[PDB]
C-alpha cells in the first residue's frame, strides 16, 4: 500500500516514534506496512502491532458506546423526535470500527497466523483474532451476530488449548488471553458463571506458579492477576 516504498526497519522505527507522540493511527499504519513486508514479527514487533490497533479501536469503541447510549435514550417513550442524525452518526462510527477490525483480521489471515509456529506467536495472534471478532460482536445486531460470536469463541478456544499445553500458568500472554476470554463469556456469550469460573481458575493456577519467577517476571504476572481479581470483585 502507501507504505510499500518504505523500509521495514524504518516503519518499525516510526511506529515507535508514533507511540511516543501518541499518534496511534499513524502507528497502526506503520505496523500494517511492516506486516505487509511478509516477514514474521518479533515479540517486540507483535506488541507494537497490538498496542497500535488496541488504541485505535479503543477510541472508536468508546465513541460508539457514547452514541449508542444517546440513540437508546432517543427511542424511549416521551422522547422528542430529533430525526435520523443520531442513528446516521452512530452508523458512521460503527462502519469505521468494523473497517479497522476487518483490517486486523485480514492481517492475521494473510498471513500472520499460518506462519506462526511457536506457541508464543501463535497464541498471541489467535488471542488477537478472538479480540477483534469480540469487538465486531459488541456492535453486531443482524443475521451474522451468532457467527461472529462463534468466530471469537473458536479463536479464543484454540489459543487456550495451545497455551495450556505449551506455556506456564503465569505467562502474561496466557494470562491476558484468559482475562479476555472471561470478558467474552461475561459480556458477549451471556455466560457469567463460565466467566467467573475461568477467572478464578486462571488466578489460582498462576498464584501457585509465582514461586518459579524472577522479581521482574513476578511483577509482570501479578499485574495481570490483579485485573482478573478486579473483574471477580465486580462480578461477585
Amino acid at each position: 500500500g502507501a507504505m510499500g516504498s518504505m523500509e521495514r526497519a524504518s516503519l518499525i522505527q516510526k511506529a515507535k516514534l508514533a507511540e511516543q507522540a501518541e499518534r496511534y493511527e499513524d502507528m497502526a499504519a506503520f505496523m500494517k506496512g511492516a506486516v505487509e513486508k511478509g516477514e514474521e514479527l518479533s515479540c517486540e514487533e507483535r506488541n507494537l502491532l497490538s498496542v497500535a490497533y488496541k488504541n485505535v479501536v479503543g477510541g472508536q469503541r468508546a465513541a460508539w458506546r457514547v452514541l449508542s447510549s444517546i440513540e437508546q435514550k432517543s427511542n424511549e417513550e416521551g422522547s422528542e423526535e430529533k430525526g435520523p442524525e443520531v442513528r446516521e452518526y452512530r452508523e458512521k462510527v460503527e462502519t469505521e470500527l468494523q473497517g479497522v477490525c476487518d483490517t486486523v483480521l485480514g492481517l492475521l489471515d494473510s498471513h500472520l497466523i499460518k506462519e506462526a509456529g511457536d506457541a508464543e506467536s501463535r497464541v498471541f495472534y489467535l488471542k488477537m483474532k478472538g479480540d477483534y471478532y469480540r469487538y465486531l460482536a459488541e456492535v453486531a445486531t443482524g443475521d451474522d451476530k451468532k457467527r461472529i460470536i462463534d468466530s471469537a469463541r473458536s479463536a479464543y478456544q484454540e489459543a487456550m488449548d495451545i497455551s495450556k499445553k505449551e506455556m506456564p500458568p503465569t505467562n502474561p500472554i496466557r494470562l491476558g488471553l484468559a482475562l479476555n476470554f472471561s470478558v467474552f463469556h461475561y459480556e458477549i456469550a451471556n455466560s457469567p458463571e463460565e466467566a467467573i469460573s475461568l477467572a478464578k481458575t486462571t488466578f489460582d493456577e498462576a498464584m501457585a506458579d509465582l514461586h518459579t519467577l524472577s522479581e521482574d517476571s513476578y511483577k509482570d504476572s501479578t499485574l495481570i492477576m490483579q485485573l482478573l481479581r478486579d473483574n471477580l470483585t465486580l462480578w461477585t
Binding site: 506488541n47 497490538s50 494470562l175 479476555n180 470478558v183 509482570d220 495481570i224 485485573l227 478486579d230 465486580l234
Partner: peptide
C-alpha cells in the same frame, strides 16, 4: 467501574 480487559505490553 468498567470491567478490565488485557492491557499488558512486554
Amino acid at each position: 467501574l468498567r470491567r478490565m480487559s488485557d492491557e499488558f505490553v512486554d
